[PDB]
């Protein structure tokens, strides 16, 4: 139904601009009010700025005054949050919230989200952008059980995180343990998945780990060989 | 007039036309309904600039 898709995020020196999209689908861009709101990782949310169902500014918070700038584009069906002179403790998960009330014209001032999005990772550092590195971890000989024997990729060497793994085209929703990364002591990171893997008879999957890094972008299509 | 003449003759002659005239101005319109949105717009809460 709703797909709030999330568009503009990545690494960004402290003290430039960038813009932030969020285009609508699913629902009518004229009568749902749309905000934004930030998540830092574990340390809970926080609301930025927001608009009504028309071109209608509800705030902002006791930090983010001055510097950002939200536009709402009906037109389009988008809304923009305009982001200047961003700082060390701007790095959170921006989401894109909508309005479950119709906004009516006589009533009380009232906002509470009902549809959420997936966000995207604004971080805000002075380090660079890094080229990921793929391996095709070897799915050894060891079998005991059916599915004993697992492949998977070894992504390192990546500062941003926006790290999203495909198998196929996009598929396969089985079970695939992707771990968390983890900073090295030196600001990279490193990914890596688990995939049952059955017995090997020409009848398996593709081996294919297609990696996309937004900060980084590059299309790794090298396949896994035992 | 119709006639013109200072002795007209015996008969019957077809002189004018009566024509009852009208009394109001009567227009009827149907009811209203479906009120344009012009209670949002023109009493909104808040613009943006
Ligand atoms: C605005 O609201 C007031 C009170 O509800 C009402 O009297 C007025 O007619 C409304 N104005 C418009 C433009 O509808």
């Known amino acids: 139904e709703v797909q709030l898709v999330e568009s503009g995020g990545g690494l960004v020196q402290p003290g430039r601009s960038l813009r932030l999209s969020c285009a609508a689908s699913?629902?009518?861009?004229?009568?749902?009010?749309i905000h934004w709101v930030r998540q830092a990782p574990g340390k809970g949310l926080e609301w930025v700025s927001g608009?009504?169902?028309?071109?209608?500014?509800?705030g902002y918070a006791d930090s983010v005054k001055g510097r950002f700038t939200i536009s709402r584009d009906n037109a389009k069906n988008s809304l923009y949050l305009q982001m200047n002179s961003l700082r060390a403790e701007d790095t959170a998960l921006y989401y894109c919230?909508?309005?479950?009330?119709?906004?009516?014209?006589?009533?009380?001032?009232?906002?509470?989200?009902?549809?959420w999005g997936q966000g995207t990772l604004v971080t805000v550092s002075s380090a660079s952008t890094k080229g990921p590195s793929v391996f095709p971890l070897a799915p050894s000989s060891k079998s005991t059980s059916g599915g004993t024997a697992a492949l998977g990729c070894l992504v390192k060497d990546y500062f941003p995180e926006p790290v999203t793994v495909s198998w196929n085209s996009g598929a396969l929703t089985s079970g695939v343990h992707t771990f968390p990364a983890v900073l090295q002591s030196s600001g990279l990171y490193s990914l890596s998945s688990v995939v049952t893997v059955p017995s090997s008879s020409l009848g398996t999957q593709t081996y294919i780990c297609n990696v996309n890094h937004k900060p980084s972008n590059t299309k790794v299509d090298k396949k896994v060989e035992p | 007039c119709t006639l013109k003449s200072f002795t007209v003759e015996k008969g019957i002659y077809q002189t004018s036309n009566f024509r009852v005239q009208p009394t109001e101005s009567i227009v009827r319109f149907p009811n209203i309904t479906n009120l344009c949105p012009f209670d949002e717009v023109f009493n909104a809460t808040r613009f943006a600039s």
């Open positions: 608009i009504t169902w028309n071109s209608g500014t509800i």
């Open positions: 699913g629902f009518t861009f004229d009568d749902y009010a």
């Open positions: 919230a909508k309005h479950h009330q119709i906004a009516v014209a006589g009533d009380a001032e009232d906002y509470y989200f009902d549809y």
